[PDB]
Amino acid sequence: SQKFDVVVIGAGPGGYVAAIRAAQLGLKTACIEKYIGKEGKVALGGTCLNVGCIPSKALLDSSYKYHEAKEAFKVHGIEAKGVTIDVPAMVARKANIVKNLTGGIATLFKANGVTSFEGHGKLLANKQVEVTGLDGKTQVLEAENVIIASGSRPVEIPPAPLSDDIIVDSTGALEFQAVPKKLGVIGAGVIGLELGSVWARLGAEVTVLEALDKFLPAADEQIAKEALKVLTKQGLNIRLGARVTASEVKKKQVTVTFTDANGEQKETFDKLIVAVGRRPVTTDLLAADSGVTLDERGFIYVDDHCKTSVPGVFAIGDVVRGAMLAHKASEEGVMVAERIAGHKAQMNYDLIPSVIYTHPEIAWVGKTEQTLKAEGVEVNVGTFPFAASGRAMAANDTTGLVKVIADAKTDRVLGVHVIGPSAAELVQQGAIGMEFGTSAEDLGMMVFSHPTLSEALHEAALAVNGHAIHIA
Amino acid sequence: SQKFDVVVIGAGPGGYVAAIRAAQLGLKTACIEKYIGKEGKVALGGTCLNVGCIPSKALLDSSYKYHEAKEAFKVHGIEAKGVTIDVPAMVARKANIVKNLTGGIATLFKANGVTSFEGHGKLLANKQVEVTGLDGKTQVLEAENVIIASGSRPVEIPPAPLSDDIIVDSTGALEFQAVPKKLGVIGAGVIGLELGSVWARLGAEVTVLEALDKFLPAADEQIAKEALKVLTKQGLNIRLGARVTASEVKKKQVTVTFTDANGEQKETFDKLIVAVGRRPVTTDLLAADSGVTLDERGFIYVDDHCKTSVPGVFAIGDVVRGAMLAHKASEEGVMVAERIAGHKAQMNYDLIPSVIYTHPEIAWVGKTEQTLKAEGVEVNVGTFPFAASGRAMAANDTTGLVKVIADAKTDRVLGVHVIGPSAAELVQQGAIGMEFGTSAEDLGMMVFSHPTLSEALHEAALAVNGHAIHIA
Ligand SMILES: Cc1cc2nc3c(=O)[nH]c(=O)nc-3n(C[C@H](O)[C@H](O)[C@H](O)COP(=O)(O)OP(=O)(O)OC[C@H]3O[C@@H](n4cnc5c(N)ncnc54)[C@H](O)[C@@H]3O)c2cc1C
Ligand SMILES: Cc1cc2nc3c(=O)[nH]c(=O)nc-3n(C[C@H](O)[C@H](O)[C@H](O)COP(=O)(O)OP(=O)(O)OC[C@H]3O[C@@H](n4cnc5c(N)ncnc54)[C@H](O)[C@@H]3O)c2cc1C
């Protein structure tokens, strides 16, 4: 066709959501997407739905159930005689969910009147977007507003190049039709920890090599310390400050050479996952004179409203600054669709939660204790273990703790941090608190259901100021 | 000893908490409790901890895991060859938690400086409490304030009198060393539903006889309809409007005679649980001239601050008006202790959440739809199924829905109702919403982590006003 109010490039969380919101606001919207899926046709949903968020979660769940049936069922008096996992079958279920969701956002699109275009899209000058279709047929849409949501891709690293299915990335890790007897991960970050956990739960001997001396440096020190202790005890041999120098694939194995503190070591995995990072994709996206700028690291340059250097053009999700997380991309999506339609939506970057779906699950929102100490903030902190949780004890899951940090001067809750059962939900409660300004005492005065895990949020807010009923 | 600032009668949730708060507030406090536990010595914690909240939660978890292992493990490619449950060992694990919690609050008490007294306590005139010790030895404490937390107990009913281990109550049901082949529950309310689920999950054939025509009449109609559907499908033969006329224990079985709409039927269970209700215990609690009043139903009469008819005497939890829920008791416990120390603590009775721990879990806070319709409130409502949940799909748990109700005029969220995975924490996020006054749009403009069950709360809030991203 020729004219549209919004032309969205990318159909991941930032893009499909932005497209769906602008459509609901009444903008004639078209979205361009080229990912040829898993059954030959284009798949909407991007990284999160295809190779990200939904597949890694589904594997983490099935591997966990497997783990519980083998390690934690006897305390309930449940003896499963010889339980096994069929990794193909597992992976199929994952495939399936992906298939069904992919389909779901297509119907969502049609239901909302979104004109989908299959092909690579590129922003030319004067906001025309050249949709190089799939079959070579090229086309030029004229757009009143352009929303770029091209996304991000794995960092490739020289010492470990993706060689076949031996040195593989996020995606390949999600695809093993069998358990690597020994497995190495380079990067002890969210994706490393999670892909690590999956295969380790099913019998893989995992070593996670990570170049930095600090485990999880964005999580709170206390949660970090706790996380690491738990995960190593869970089976992941995490080696900090180990720098990879070389790979050598040979006889269906690869040998990583690395220097940690006592120099060079070499270890031989059957599979090696490079989970070092992700980088914005700006590949054939911008014509030489589009007007759009990039910063030094490859991110498209945007302000706080995701407006680019050219008016009418906005950039969101993993190609622009911010935390590379699904819900940041969709909310930017919405901020941007909302603004195009005329509402002055603002996006609160201080409250994006972070969750790591390990079991126990790490999650957090707000500032970390150390940020606050380095910022010279005197804070009161309350903690509450899941071990004093009656609900946790019925549940037989008592690892972890909640931690609330509050300004010592005002009693404003500054950050809520938890590792343990339902961390995501418990921090979400704190985020809702925080969004409206809770103090520890405000959280304290509320009625939390008994028995529930939410109560550990309760007790630790109480604890910020001395009065936790069930501890001191 | 002789003089105390607070003397607390009963060490349930209301009692022990109030005792611990008073102690922290600086009052010389003593608490009296007579429940001879499971190992011969007195057990602190009350109904909730000894035959209530924790024991029923722990069987519900062990029975659930057995059920998952037998019915929903294969879709993950897990095959447990022949899984069995050792009911003895199951029950023992429960026994254990209780033991460990019982002991926990004793240390909590000692840690706080709480003088425990073992024996029956009776409030004489002029606030002196007569501790009839355990060994006949009577004693009189003189109390500046007295907090009565005597609790509640199973309603007994004539046509089904507790006969041996055949017609049993909440407590005996939590004690079965084996699965009743066929099992009847009289009462299709929280404790009925939960004890039913436990034995049904492990093979019991359950019939739940309930005299009213309305299932879960306090729960929102939609959730009730949904709940019922799910629970019958889960195996509980719930028969509404059926009135029990007679029991007849014979050859280790009992035959209940009942009239529903097509008259009399008789059904023969191996075990019968009477879970018709609970009533306040005021037994030899009040000396004829204490000054303390009872209403018509047995409840001690109190106002909004739990002040009785005689100044300096307060009543809390199941002996007074309100919902018979452990968190209602504990918070009254704290309100009361807080006020005796000089703070004007108020208790919000509008926000007490309700949770039924079936799987899926029902839970709610705020007004139901029909309350609001009968009150002539025009409300917008938003719903969001767990089937559109990515996280729920990964989890393989998609039954259920969320429901937010909002005033149509102001957009204030009036009630959050959910049946499904994590209902409790989802409503606890709503409750925090509600305590600070969220409108649906305020819930909507917040960043909820992706993928999480919490998101279903986010979506249905959106949906209250038209814009739910992942549905219409
Ligand atoms: C293993 C893994 C697990 C993850 N799990 C989570 C998680 O659980 N929670 C979380 O929040 N984050 C998670 N993330 C990250 C999350 O997926 C990303 O943050 C998020 O998907 C970024 O969304 P986006 O819309 O910016 O980009 P993407 O999802 O990368 O989508 C971009 C889309 O644009 C398309 N495209 C690009 N250029 C063009 C073009 N020029 N024309 C047409 N089409 C084009 C791409 O094909 C793609 O479909 C995970 C990442 C990985 C790899
Ligand atoms: C099977 C079951 C499950 C339940 N599950 C939950 C749940 O999961 N969530 C929820 O919120 N509620 C639940 N409840 C209800 C919950 O137990 C009650 O709401 C709550 O315990 C009431 O607290 P209380 O302190 O008022 O009374 P109680 O727990 O009954 O405590 C009263 C105490 O006072 C003692 N006592 C009585 N008189 C005297 C006397 N004169 N002198 C000395 N001591 C005395 C008694 O021995 C007892 O220890 C459940 C009930 C049952 C039966």
Swiss-Prot record, chains A, B:
Query: Which top EC class applies here?
Result: oxidoreductase
For FAD, which residues are the binding ones?
A: 33-48, 57, 121, 318, 326
Output the InterPro entries linked to this UniProt entry.
Class-I_Pyr_Nuc-Dis_Oxidored (IPR050151), FAD/NAD-bd_sf (IPR036188), FAD/NAD-binding_dom (IPR023753), FAD/NAD-linked_Rdtase_dimer_sf (IPR016156), Lipoamide_DH (IPR006258), Pyr_nuc-diS_OxRdtase (IPR001100), Pyr_nucl-diS_OxRdtase_dimer (IPR004099), Pyr_OxRdtase_I_AS (IPR012999)
Question: Which molecular function term from Gene Ontology is one that the record holds?
Answer: dihydrolipoyl dehydrogenase (NADH) activity
Positions the record marks as coiled coil are none
List keywords of the entry alphabetically. Cytoplasm, Disulfide bond, FAD, Flavoprotein, NAD, Oxidoreductase, Redox-active center
Key word Iron present: no
| Localization per record | Cytoplasm
Q: List the disulfide bonds.
A: C48-C53
Checking SUPFAM superfamilies in the record gives: FAD/NAD(P)-binding domain (SSF51905), FAD/NAD-linked reductases, dimerisation (C-terminal) domain (SSF55424)
Give the enzyme's EC designation: 1.8.1.4
Matching Gene3D superfamilies: 3.30.390.30, FAD/NAD(P)-binding domain (3.50.50.60)
User: Keyword Isomerase on this protein?
Assistant: no
Q: Which Pfam families match?
A: Pyr_redox_2, Pyr_redox_dim
List the active-site residues.
H450
Task of the protein: The branched-chain alpha-keto dehydrogenase complex catalyzes the overall conversion of alpha-keto acids to acyl-CoA and CO(2). It contains multiple copies of 3 enzymatic components: branched-chain alpha-keto acid decarboxylase (E1), lipoamide acyltransferase (E2) and lipoamide dehydrogenase (E3).
Query: What family does the Swiss-Prot or TrEMBL record give for this protein?
Result: Belongs to the class-I pyridine nucleotide-disulfide oxidoreductase family.
Subunit field text? Homodimer.
Protein name (record): Dihydrolipoyl dehydrogenase
